Amino acid sequence: KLXXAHXXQEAXKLXXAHXXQEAX
Ligand SMILES: [Zn+2]
Fold first, then answer.
1. Rounded distance, CA 18 to CA 21, Å?
2. How far apart are CA 16 and CA 5, in angstroms?
C-alpha cells in the first residue's frame, strides 16, 4: 500500500494483493 516500487517485484504492477504484503 505504501508503494516503494513493490520491493522490486514487477508482479506488483498487477496487484494480487501484493502476495499478502501490506507494505504494498
Ligand atoms: Zn506490491
1. 5
2. 15
Deposited resolution, Å: 0.8
Name the structure determination technique.
X-ray
- Distance of CA 22 from the midpoint of ligand 1 (Å): 8
Residue 12 alpha carbon to ligand 1 centre in Å = 4
Question: Separation of 11 CA from ligand 1 center, angstroms?
Answer: 7
Instruction: Give residue 13 CA to ligand 1 midpoint distance, Å.
Output: 7
Alpha-carbon dihedral angle through residues 6, 12, 17, 19, given to the nearest 10 degrees = -80
